[PDB]
Amino acid sequence: GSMTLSSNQYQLPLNVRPYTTTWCSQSPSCSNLLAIGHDTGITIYCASEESTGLTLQELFTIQTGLPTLHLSFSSSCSYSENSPVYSLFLACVCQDNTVRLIITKNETIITQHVLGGKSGHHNFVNDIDIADVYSADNRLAEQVIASVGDDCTLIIWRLTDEGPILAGYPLSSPGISVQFRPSNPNQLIVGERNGNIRIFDWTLNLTELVKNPWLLTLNTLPLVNSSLANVRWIGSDGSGILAMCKSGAWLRWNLFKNLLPNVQGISLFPSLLGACPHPRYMDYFATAHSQHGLIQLINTYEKDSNSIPIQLGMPIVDFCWHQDGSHLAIATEGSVLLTRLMGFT
């Protein structure tokens, strides 16, 4: 099954290899910003109204000197039209296995916090996320960064008003994904390589030597008959959980014999990158055959209908939904595509 669509392709400069793509969805005023992490930093594009639809305009490049492998925007990002200045707050992972908070005025990094050495991860970092925690008086109490790696550790990095607070929690296998809960930054979900899914409230024990800080542990292993690709909250309130295996087997739990998933299925292709849930419709998610350049659109509650909107004929590096739910940004090895699915308009 195909879909009616329109795509624009923008070449990256010849010496630039992309690694990751993300929209600045966490901050409404900056929701049209697209970031591409590449071999020498982060390039920021701006999606604007053109016939109809969107076009990409490169704004600037944040220089880091090494590849950026994972990236997450903060809700603290803001725009001011004085000399237009974007004040960005980026959480990212770099080739040197550091976890970073990058604070910019346009391309200029005015402040940077780097977690490495003995304090950070001792192996490859696989995923990162960031959340803003507000006081009872509605002020920015702290910014919290969560990261997981092949050192089988979840690191909670809290940047508070009075210095950083650092905490590490053991995993039973490499951490392969992490994400704060929508509408509740006190909670997050962690995907382990072995199929374990940890749900965690990191504010509860603020009781040191504890192998079980977790609130709840789900598990894909007894349900799929290889390693876990990712796990994501779905819903604006995180009322559901979507897990995807590398094989293409996906599982969905709704939170509100209720021991099995509410529904599961298997994608047409393997999913090296995992699932990318739709911003507006819980039932929909996108998954890619990254090596062959295909993207399948799956509805979890729909009949077994095979919908493949995108075929590129070249490898896909990363992709992500625009917050409007009709646009996808797709990175290939030498370009970025802006694709508009007409069915979602």
Tokens of 93: 């992972």
Query: Do 78 and 87 form a contact (C-beta atoms < 8 A)?
Result: yes
Question: What is d(CA 277, CA 270) in angstroms, rounded to the nearest whole number?
Answer: 17
CA–CA dist 245, 269 (Å, integer) = 11
Q: How far apart are CA 200 and CA 66, in angstroms?
A: 32
Residues 6+ apart with CB under 8 A from 19: 37, 38, 39, 67, 68, 69, 317, 318
Query: What is the stated resolution of the deposited model, in angstroms?
Result: 2.6
Which is it for the CA torsion 176, 36, 107, 12, positive or negative?
A: positive
- DSSP H helix total and E strand total for the chain: 0, 29
CATH of the domain at 343: 2.130.10.10
Q: Give CA separation, 138 vs 131, 220, 236, 307, in Å.
A: 15, 38, 20, 44
Which residues are within 8 A (CB) of 36 and not within 5 positions of it... i.e. 6 or more apart? 12, 18, 20, 21, 42, 43, 45, 331, 336
**Count of domains observed in the chain:** 1
Give the number of other Cβ atoms within 10 Å of residue 193's Cβ.
21
Q: Tell me if 337 sits within 8 A of 343, measured CB to CB.
A: no
Solved using:
X-ray
The range of the structural domain enclosing residue 175 comes to 1-345
Alpha-carbon span 320 to 339, nearest angstrom? 10
Residues 6+ apart with CB under 8 A from 110: 103, 104
